[PDB]
């Protein structure tokens, strides 16, 4: 029982390496019966146990007790399902033909891209693109633009093609070749290319891709060049993701996104489907409440107001079952009256097509409340930490939450909700029907239950000081969810008892007041080990983070921002070199740093660094040894923050991408001489100095030591003017695309001379400054303007 | 435990034969999911150490522990894995429509392919091959020749067909009759092929058949009888292979090869691509240097260019990412932009036609620095040496190691550097695409791995003395790769763990320095039981190999090259019998051999021979025993090298092809009166005497003594003249067809004398004869030409 215990142990080290891999395989696999998704859904949560208790390899004789239980649990369940797989042996599309009358208007849109179809001819093949989510409108909008008249006067030949998600090219081409009137030929691939070329010669031809996916999409140029062109024809793909609108590369402004529906238009939708019978006209007026009351909360989606349409359609209009629908309304539409109109498959096929990370990313979406504006660096630090982001490549922490953040909000499933002047996104959200989709998927294994007992992570909402959240010992997270201003009130035995999970990798606490100091809260995170990030933002009875952290070693992350009474950090943030994120933005009252932050070398971000001072903290010397940091935050307090030769302490970081200076608390003009030799790389892509005390520019804002700068904004500072080596125009320009000037109450300059140094602007946007009088906007003084360029 | 240790012997004898059938049947299905791709990735690791611990079996219970566990483990995996796949239940082709703009310069090929057309009348059927690697221009340069205007005049039926490297022979013969404008016909094949005989009478057709491979290929000559000849026909076939180009025997001078592209031309192909938006033409500065940086690191591929640029071209254009694919190249195009474009997929269905045994031959080159110009001679040494050649019907050693080598040639996967005057290859490399293609394979199983533990066998690159590379016990082989002229600095225990490892077959080091004599490192090597080659090549320490070599009775060659410091040749290189090559050129200081070398007689290579005196080493009586060598090298010194009637030791040798006589420290006359009754075989391909002594001609060189020659050379000499027999112009001829004279100041003969005794020659190539001023070539003196004729 001993001796055996490595054995014991690889066993089952290869047998989660299939199980998973059978986990690749059997969501691939379509025509799913019971058996099938019943025991997926229990080989998942096994996995997950496996897994769990595999990590423990890292006496010897309890452990080979857990090792032969769970191997015997997992050998019976196989023989136990597999007679039951040998006792049985083993579509979508469209068309141009609709109603045009229950269509609720789209006449501006309509009109918009038939004007855009009437400049066919400027260019050599003009290609659209109708993105947005799923069921909004966008193969009607594309059946009401070519089935009007005046399109048919101008194409000759109209070419409406299904491409579904599953598909082949020989079927695609050889629709094309039915659409053109020839006779459907028995007929091989070329000489189809062939035909489709050859019928195609003089004539003005608008062809209509319906649906088009991201999946194996290279046929589109392998027809592209079949195309003629000079001819004035158009192609219109409508599709659900930006990622195709790029790839077949339409245009910036050629893509027309649908909007969700007014209140007004989606009530005569639901009256001109729900009330059928007597001419789409509501008959008797106790439903009308009721029935705006589930318009309005249906939320703007033409697919759903016409499935709870004909929901109704099939009742007795008597006031109770619309009532209750009204007040039970997802769980019918999860029955789709049994299965018959199916939004949610219509959803869950946008779902099914993501890879297996991004389904994972996706699915923690399930975890926050009704309408909720989610931070978007929350959701990527959640991702990072628990592991649904791998990295060899060099895209190791933060870019690879970028791209992942990217490639969901490109699928039309995460919609953005502002966005700065440098175009990066902040805060996110996610339509309902999207939400309750990925809650549905929750319900399966055990990633969020939110009721009962199996739970893998867990979500808290506000003011959970007396509702006792039930915590069981699996939790591998804890996220703290907020409405945009609310505060999580906890008492002490929840955070008490979320130091009893042995297996917790996220742990960020976001708005939450506490009853004790979290230093005796926390004192016993020795028995957290495998956890991975802590954003302890904006906390109040945080003063001084526990010293029980020498064990963790694993640490990936360490945030704690705005949390501006945080007096000491420990020197044990030196030692365990596995660090990617430390980030404290905007804390004040701190002593500035440990000693050895140049110890530990693969870390990205660096935020909030206040270098110390002579026999202090830690200086500017050791940032060179930061080859890998591509972030970097620095706050200037008065002049012996920084040492001379030092000054040029910023010049050897090779992946350096942003720079932020926050002179807020500034003393002397000792500071603003020592500044002016901090030189940034030549790459350098975005940096926002901020209070800056000085009264002309720094002296290496030119184009001479930073060419490759693009995006630059300049909040509130004693900045007067600007030097003559701010304009260099003699041959040299900034080449810079986004320029900000919050609140200057001391700087002048032109605004041609501006656009006759920086040739490559699109965006200024410039708020208080009372005082320049020039510019193209609507007032760069009191209020603010953009100045959207063409 | 111990009685059934035969039984549970050869149950493992049935098993690894069931199981490595199995894994030559799993690599030719189709559709393979993740759990085959996973359980065929580990039954390759467990069938190497099947039969790594099954040799053990030439006390008997630690073994009969081996094998329980073993079995053991093998049973286990199976019934592991087996519910799995009791669960689940389970195109390429080409056009003659292309886009004609971003085709970058291709004139001057497109000229001469249409004066090749122009002279279709010439022949009865003239058939034409464009044979090249993968992606290399071969369909482009077909679809740009036959879209032209003039061969639509010329030819009135041309006919596109894509044969795929799956396919049929009635889809090709029905798609021929599509391309002919008769309808797609129900129809069975004897009657489509009489359809198309007789639908081309008095024709002028032209038919490009596209990627034709290796595979079935009798359909060819089902075909070729039903094409109507003397009409001025003409067939191009675009393949990937010049076996298929002899196959269908186009031409030697008919086939086309289009290069690789120039930095200029790939630069403006990769601006048209990637920045496609304004009009092909980079717009910002700031990306030349890095994208003219990858640019010349893709190395000419259009194919990769085009994925490169279809990569790029879905991004923001800023700096970063621009440079981090500059320096992270290959980890993106294996990802395929997560499976799109698939350059890994174009080329590793070219993997995917070789047999097995060359399936192991290309994958050893895996092994290898960046661009190093590798030797064939150490390849096909390491091929016969570690087993990845076998043998029965007399093709036993180094001619079953040519045509490995040649089949790898013909595929077009290595690529040839340079050719001597007799047609042969000394030196290859290969593209890199390739060479990272041929790493991700080995990226499986662990053939190599190289880093991290699992590795089959390690390739030494240089100055390793202080490294320490990691050397685990499995290590099948240890070879020396260098860059062409640096030497792998190399310390003592290294080489002493070397012989540590039990299971090592392949042991060459060809260019490393030692810091202690090779006498004692390599003095345990009666550890070493396995060993099958050692080439100690030019190595300073060596002196004495160590005299612990008896026990090595496997070592089928044994090579030491230009190794001026080998005194004696131990007796222990007599008695095992089993050898196949013994290599000593140029090995000055060396006591000329021991005695029994007519014992062993399996041997095919006998180089450096050095025949002894009269009470020393060896004399040439025992060459006639010697019955199956094939290549042969003599070197002289003095004129009791060789014995009177020992003089007639080289008429029997049935096999012989080759003779190198190096008579380089030549004392004597004695010993050229002594050469002259050295007559070789009738039988004899190429010579080389290169050094001679002698001022006439041996008095054998005439197509009296040996008909049958082909190439020759002729090195440095005292020669003067040639004798009357070596003309011998009454009706005999040389039939002679490679001619070589490299450095003679003292032979004087004509050329039109040559002309009309040598009817055959194709290049004679001469350039250091500062005394004939009669040849066709530019100088026959201080430089040197080939007279290539017509
Ligand atoms: N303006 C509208 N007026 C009335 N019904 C509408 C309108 N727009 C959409 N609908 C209805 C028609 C269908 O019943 C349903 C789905 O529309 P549809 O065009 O298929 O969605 P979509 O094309 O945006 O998404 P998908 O890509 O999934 O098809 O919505
Ligand atoms: N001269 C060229 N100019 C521009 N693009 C080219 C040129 N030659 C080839 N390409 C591009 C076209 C395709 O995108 C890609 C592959 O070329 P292609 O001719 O299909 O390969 P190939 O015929 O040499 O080999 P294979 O048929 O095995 O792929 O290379």
């Known amino acids: 029982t001993v001796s055996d215990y490595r054995k014991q142990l690889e066993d089952l080290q290869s047998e989660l390496k299939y199980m998973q891999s059978f986990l690749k395989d059997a969501e691939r696999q379509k025509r799913t019966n019971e058996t099938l998704r019943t025991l997926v859904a229990d ?35 196989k023989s136990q399902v597999e007679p039951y797989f040998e006792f049985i042996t083993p579509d979508r599309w469209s068309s141009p033909v609709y109603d045009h009358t229950q269509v609720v208007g789209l006449e501006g849109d309509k009109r918009k891209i038939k004007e855009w179809l009437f400049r066919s001819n400027d260019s050599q093949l003009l290609i659209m693109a109708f993105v947005g989510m799923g069921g909004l409108g966008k193969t009607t909008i594309a059946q009401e633009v070519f089935n009007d008249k005046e399109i048919e006067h101008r194409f000759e030949r109209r070419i409406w093609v299904s491409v579904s998600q599953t598909f082949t090219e020989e079927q695609i081409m050889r629709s094309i ?33 319906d649906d088009v996916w991201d999946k194996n999409l290279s046929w589109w140029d392998k027809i ?50 729900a009330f059928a019978a007597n001419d789409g006209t509501c008959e ?39 009532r209750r629908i009204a007040e039970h309304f997802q769980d019918e539409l999860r029955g789709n009256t049994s299965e018959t109109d199916n939004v949610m498959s219509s959803l869950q096929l946008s779902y099914d097509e993501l890879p297996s990370h991004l389904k994972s990313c996706i699915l923690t979406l399930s975890l926050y409340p009704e309408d909720c504006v989610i931070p978007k660096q929350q959701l990527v630090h959640g991702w990072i930490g628990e592991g649904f982001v791998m990295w060899r490549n060099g895209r190791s922490a933060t870019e690879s939450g970028e791209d992942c953040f990217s490639g969901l909000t490109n699928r039309c499933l995460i919609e953005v909700v502002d966005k700065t002047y440098s175009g990066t996104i902040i805060t996110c ?45 699996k939790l591998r997270g804890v996220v703290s969810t907020t409405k945009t201003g609310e505060v999580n009130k906890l008492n002490s035995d929840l955070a008490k008892k979320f130091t009893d999970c042995k297996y917790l990798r996220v742990l960020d606490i976001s708005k939450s007041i506490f009853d004790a100091p979290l230093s005796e809260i926390l004192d016993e995170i020795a028995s957290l080990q495998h ?232 965006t200024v946007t410039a708020n208080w400054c009372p005082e320049l009088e020039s510019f193209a906007i609507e007032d760069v003084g009191f209020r603010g303007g953009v100045w959207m360029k063409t």
């Open 531 to 762: 956890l991975a990030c802590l954003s302890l933002s904006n906390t109040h009875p945080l003063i001084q983070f526990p010293r029980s952290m020498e064990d963790l070693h694993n640490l990936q992350i360490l945030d704690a921002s705005y949390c501006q009474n945080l007096k000491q950090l420990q020197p044990c943030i030196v030692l365990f070199k596995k660090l990617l994120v430390l980030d404290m933005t905007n804390c004040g009252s701190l002593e500035c740093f440990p000693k050895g932050i140049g110890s530990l070398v693969k870390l990205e971000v660096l935020l909030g660094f206040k270098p110390a001072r002579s026999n202090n903290g830690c200086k500017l010397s050791e940032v060179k040894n930061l080859t890998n940091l591509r972030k970097l935050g620095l706050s200037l307090t008065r002049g012996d923050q920084i040492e001379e030769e030092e000054l040029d302490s910023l010049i050897n970081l090779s992946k350096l991408m942003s720079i932020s200076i926050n002179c807020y608390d500034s003393y002397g003009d000792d500071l603003i001489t020592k500044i002016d030799a901090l030189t940034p790389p030549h790459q350098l892509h975005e940096l926002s100095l901020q209070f800056y005390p000085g009264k002309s520019s720094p002296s290496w804002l030119s184009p001479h030591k930073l060419p490759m700068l693009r995006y630059m904004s300049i909040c509130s500072g004693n900045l007067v003017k600007m030097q003559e080596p701010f304009w260099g125009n003699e041959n040299t320009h900034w080449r810079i695309e986004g320029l900000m000037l919050s609140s200057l109450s001391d700087l002048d300059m032109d605004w041609e001379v501006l656009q006759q140094s920086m040739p490559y602007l699109r």
């Open 43 to 77: 080989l998942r949560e096994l996995v997950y146990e496996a897994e769990d208790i595999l990590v423990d390899c890292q006496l010897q004789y309890k452990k080979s007790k857990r090792l032969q239980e769970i191997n015997e649990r997992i050998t019976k369940i």
């Open 284 to 322: 008797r007026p106790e439903l009308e409440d009721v029935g705006k009351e589930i318009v309005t909360k249906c939320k703007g989606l033409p697919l759903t107001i016409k499935a709870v349409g004909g929901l109704l359609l099939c009742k007795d209009h008597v006031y109770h079952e619309w």
């Open 429 to 473: 959200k996610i339509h309902d029907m999207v939400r309750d989709l990925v809650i549905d998927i929750a319900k399966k294994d055990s990633f969020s239950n939110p009721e009962g007992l199996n739970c893998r992570h867990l979500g808290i909402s506000g003011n959970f000081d007396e509702k006792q959240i039930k915590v069981n010992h």
């Open 177 to 209: 070749l039915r659409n053109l009137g020839d006779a459907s030929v028995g007929d091989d691939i070329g000489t189809l290319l062939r035909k489709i070329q050859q019928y195609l010669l003089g004539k003005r031809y608008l062809i209509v891709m």
């Open 224 to 273: 592209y060049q079949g195309l003629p062109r000079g001819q004035g024809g158009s192609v219109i793909v409508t599709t659900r993701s930006e990622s195709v609108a790029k790839r077949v590369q339409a245009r910036d402004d050629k893509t027309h996104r649908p909007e969700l529906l007014s209140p007004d238009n989606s009530w005569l939708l639901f009256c001109n489907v």
